[PDB]
Amino acid sequence: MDVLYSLSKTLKDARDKIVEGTLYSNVSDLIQQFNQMIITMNGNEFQTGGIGNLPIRNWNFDFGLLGTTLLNLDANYVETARNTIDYFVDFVDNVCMDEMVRESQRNGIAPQSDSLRKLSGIKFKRINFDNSSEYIENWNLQNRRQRTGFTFHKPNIFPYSASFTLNRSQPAHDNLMGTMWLNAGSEIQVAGFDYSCAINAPANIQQFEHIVQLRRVLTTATITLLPDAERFSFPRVINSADGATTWYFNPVILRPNNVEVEFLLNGQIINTYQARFGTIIARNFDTIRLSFQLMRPPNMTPAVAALFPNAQPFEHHATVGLTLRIESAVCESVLADASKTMLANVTSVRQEYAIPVGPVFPPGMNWTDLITNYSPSREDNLQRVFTVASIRSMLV
Amino acid sequence: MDVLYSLSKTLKDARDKIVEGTLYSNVSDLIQQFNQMIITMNGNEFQTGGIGNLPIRNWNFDFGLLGTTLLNLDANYVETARNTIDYFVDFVDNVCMDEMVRESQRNGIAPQSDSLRKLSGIKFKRINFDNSSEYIENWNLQNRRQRTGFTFHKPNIFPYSASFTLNRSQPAHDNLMGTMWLNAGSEIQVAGFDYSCAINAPANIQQFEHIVQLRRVLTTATITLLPDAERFSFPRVINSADGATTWYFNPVILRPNNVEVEFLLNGQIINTYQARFGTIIARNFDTIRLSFQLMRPPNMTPAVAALFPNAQPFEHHATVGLTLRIESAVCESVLADASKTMLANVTSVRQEYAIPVGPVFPPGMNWTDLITNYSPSREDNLQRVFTVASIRSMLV
Amino acid sequence: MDVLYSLSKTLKDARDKIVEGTLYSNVSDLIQQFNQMIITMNGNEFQTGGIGNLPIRNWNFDFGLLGTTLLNLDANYVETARNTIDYFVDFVDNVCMDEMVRESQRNGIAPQSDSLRKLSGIKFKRINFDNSSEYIENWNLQNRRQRTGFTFHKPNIFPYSASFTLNRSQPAHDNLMGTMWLNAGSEIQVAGFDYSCAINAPANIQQFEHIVQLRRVLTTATITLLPDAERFSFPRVINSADGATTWYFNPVILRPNNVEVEFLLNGQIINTYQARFGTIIARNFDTIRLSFQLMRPPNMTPAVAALFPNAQPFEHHATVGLTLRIESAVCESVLADASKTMLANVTSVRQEYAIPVGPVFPPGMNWTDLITNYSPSREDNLQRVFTVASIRSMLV
Amino acid sequence: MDVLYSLSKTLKDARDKIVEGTLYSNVSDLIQQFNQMIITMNGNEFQTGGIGNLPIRNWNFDFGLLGTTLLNLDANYVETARNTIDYFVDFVDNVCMDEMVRESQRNGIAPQSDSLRKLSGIKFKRINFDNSSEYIENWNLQNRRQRTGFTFHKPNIFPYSASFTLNRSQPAHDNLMGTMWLNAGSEIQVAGFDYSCAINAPANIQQFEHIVQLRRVLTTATITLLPDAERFSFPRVINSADGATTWYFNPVILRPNNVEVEFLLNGQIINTYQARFGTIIARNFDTIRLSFQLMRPPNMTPAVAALFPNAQPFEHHATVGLTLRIESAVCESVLADASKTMLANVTSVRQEYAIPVGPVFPPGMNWTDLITNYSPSREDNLQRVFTVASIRSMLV
């Protein structure tokens, strides 16, 4: 991996720095690294495999060294370098693709394709140089069993789940009490709905709770918390839990009362926020507990007082919402997020060459199914393919 | 462009690296590059700014070099460098502004201002060194006609469009079947509404379709697909298709049925997702085709049964919705996006100096018009000014 | 491409210049170029492939150089040169055919045949010399991302379409208002027909508008615009839009009123011609808007007044016309035209060897389908095959 | 003109021939010519533009020669040559645009732009070499008082004119005898109509004549003559000669009788074609006389006999026709034609830079007005701008 990364980094530096007219002192170290790469690679045969529709490709390296002895790089130099660089970039791209489409249940962190296994030999260690990218740096940390850290903007930590729980219900679904939620991406929308508007509650207060168990720990997470859930604040016809019938939802939104957001780690309270909206920092947690309340308004103008009668039928159901967005966070594991392209790159490569589903990942690299069952073997394979994808994206 | 980028990169490196106390071996190559820049620019006269209110500015270079044999940089050295750095930064900013406010129909990729045309001379090519930024890398690859793409977080690929289509209509607008959509930025919110709830539709299923043709191909795109459209889920009074009368929309949201997303390229099915929500990957496409269906719930509770009568009047209108957010993608052409400042920078420069409208871009650099009619010439000019804006933002 | 073109150009020069009795000084430079080609090709094995019915052919080059000893070329010299040239022409023609019958969706501009891929290696660059053909010139300019130009006499820019639009219609088809058009090749014939002769029009004016979107931008275009549309000026029996019935058209031709021809680029008005007929120039456009009017004659002689009653039935339907021929134009993309034979050569080669339909071109090389869906991939493949067809037509 | 053309031809040869890998013997003479151009242009300041919206541009020439010795051209050589060529091509394009937008009543053949007047000095005559194009060759032949010739495919020799003459008429416009014609470009459709069908004409024959005077003599003209005129063979509501009223035309086409096409020079008959249709050759003529007779069919069938009564009213009007198309001709003067783009180039350059109407040409370079009043001064200016446009086309 570090050798593949160093090949790609050398090629990217060569493409960016070996340009016409440049001073040789700008590229001296790059020229030495490039020549070391050529020397290490010369004489070696590689085969990038025929998994799926990925074509079988054969690679032979017999290249001359890049010249020294120029004060400024000229067009001849750039042309020779470009020929060599183009061939090397094609090879590295094919190696990255061949690695991206493979997986093993056990030892899934180890290289899978033949070319990357060959490149893991001692003889190629000479190629290795500056491992500065986030993914390669975390790869080296993981190899050394050190703390790993990935920074995500809008981490895709929640699998898609649009569900509801009815805490009070009956076959006619006209006096219902419960909660409905959408967890997706970095966003949670939850809403506690009471059809009776807490007329018969002990203090006219209906408590609502929502626990989301993150499948990986997050740290240094900045989170926007907003009082209402726009997703569950308009009239809906919702299937019954067993699918037999449909019930009706006619929300009228009251401001949530006694909002209590707890960020928990291993069943311990780390962060607590009461009646706080806007940005909050959850420094380290694996669970989010939202406790809100519908407090029946003690005073109601006639227009308001009409909507909440003492008894049934209840036509305007009192709903209190909450929206929680994880804007950015840090996780020790690789995750899909809004800004990066690793998951999309891996999925695209798997789809383009018709890679059959393997024994590690869900078909189509479906992220909901992946992160619902984010097993350690899946974590290793995903970190591997994502590091390879990031190495590829440096050149392609 | 490469020379202007190299000037800006040299100035940025001089600001960052030529600092008090630093080992000369940290800065030797940079000092050499800086001195080569001084030597190349010395004795050359430049004129920037004769357009709009951008004032005429003349630039002369007679600057001394920087030493090459001390061991650690001291405050004297930094003071010697800083005045030259300031003059050069001013010159580069003015060259960038001069280029940003200019356009041409014939060769929009070619330089337009006098100063950048002079900097295209072979003698200035010695200034050229590490072209490592995404925009300059894409510039160099595009000059060679190599495959290269820009990576966008939330690309602004959709021109603003809030419209509706009625498949069933009549002058009173009380039994309407059709679709309403917002296309904005990287977001598509679409909603199919049936006022009769497909009471008389075959199989009680009403099919809605929505096709969005992207002006440029997106690759390796991450998409969030949610099953509701919060934008079309509340009562609305909407103008008629000719603006003669206003009709009423009173949605009640049913979950969309048989949800299908087809990402297509040149009319071919590339990606297909059925009943999939959350994160999906579209590897290569120019068109998004969303097919969804309103299905009457065969079993309704009494409130739900009341909502939808067998015949008119229809007061609660059955609506199904989809929301599609392109979180990240890659495009071979430049685009505005939520992360970068290139479009904003170019617009700000054009507005601050009252640049007359040219023959390439819409007035005021309006993005909706520009992306609606994103022609190859407009793409050329936009890539030029966006690369210049990125070069300018390296120093300003 | 440049190498294959240079080979063909050398062979053509040799065929035209190596003739009995000619001074050696007439051919000295040509002999040097030819011997350089012999030196470069000697020892290289080529295979022209077996796609479709094209025979697999193997090519071995072990030729001696052409002599330099004669003051005037004799018959023996011409015969030896003829033998070598015949083998080389056979090879170049086979390579061109093998390239023309192949296509790619990913990189359709890049060589597809194995021999043209081998000829792209650096070792063959010595062969490369004068690139003076319009197609090779455009190829080299495009490789450098320079403004390309293809000049077309009667460009085939309009896909074949004979259609009509009825703005007013009824099931009996006797009071019809609308337009009928033929768009074919470089010609547009449009005709607006009103059956009531605008008897009840707001000012006795019936407006017709025809919008034709060109698949590519045309420049420096010479266009003949004529008042009448001879194609829609005789009695016709026309299928209904659904093919259920046939209606009757009995045109009587009036002079079009307020003839306004707009040539638009990016929806902006570039050229406007009002009441102008004959030759006009459209400098740069991609859309044509033809707006014309059937104006009821304020005064009529008794026969004319008899043709047009005040109410139904209507026997003589007032038709106005417009004819628009593009005689010459310039396009940045390749196109079929009335003079060049590139499309016909590519189609003939594909049909002669029964090339299976591929993933780029329509399944006959049919031009209407191709120009209708002129995608960037299609344009790339078409430019490649048209350049190869021009290179082939230099020899065959 | 010869010097500007030599500059452009040198630049075009340099672009086409100075390519990577080519033998130096392929370019030696070209390298010498290019170096001579550099020597002659060195130390000279030029100014272009300053008219309309054409920008002022200053050009200073200080370039070195190409003295490098090589067997084959490398990238360094090509890049140096390319820098010089790009500057020179921009200069030549600007000089051509500057000359194309200018006119003078006196000495309109002579150079008008200051740069071209300076280039006419003796010191620049060294640049002059091969003058092989049709337009520059004709320019030189004319300067030598030798007979020049421009070959035209479909010469635009007829100004647009859709007219009619009534030889017998009355206010009712129901018993009309006369002719109607369209003279457009290289096409002439003419039709003689008699409403009485020559019932009372002497010998039952009605004679029609049509004289078209060409503004310039044509030679070696290939003409297609067809019996019928499809443009005047459908029902038509035509305007009155004064425009007061409208008359009705209901053609029934009879074959023209005693067809005689006379091609005349100075009123003498050069070519005569009697009852000959298809391709004919008019070797040298300035006038065309079409004489054709409507001969009443002596023997009719009842359906035919019913169309032609003895007296008014006349419903079916007997029309004979002729179509005359000049496919190719040769003119000593310059003309627009179907295949070339010189007129379109000049018009485009004048429109793009908003050139005010001058004292020689009509507004917008309208070809009908220009060719209707094709005066000697107009002819001189037109040849100048067309030669300049042909020189510009070689590079742009």
Ligand SMILES: [Cl-]
């Ligand atoms: Cl965001």
Ligand SMILES: [Zn+2]
């Ligand atoms: Zn239920």
Ligand SMILES: [Zn+2]
């Ligand atoms: Zn974001």
Ligand SMILES: [Zn+2]
């Ligand atoms: Zn409506």
Ligand SMILES: [Zn+2]
């Ligand atoms: Zn119809």
Ligand SMILES: [Zn+2]
């Ligand atoms: Zn009259």
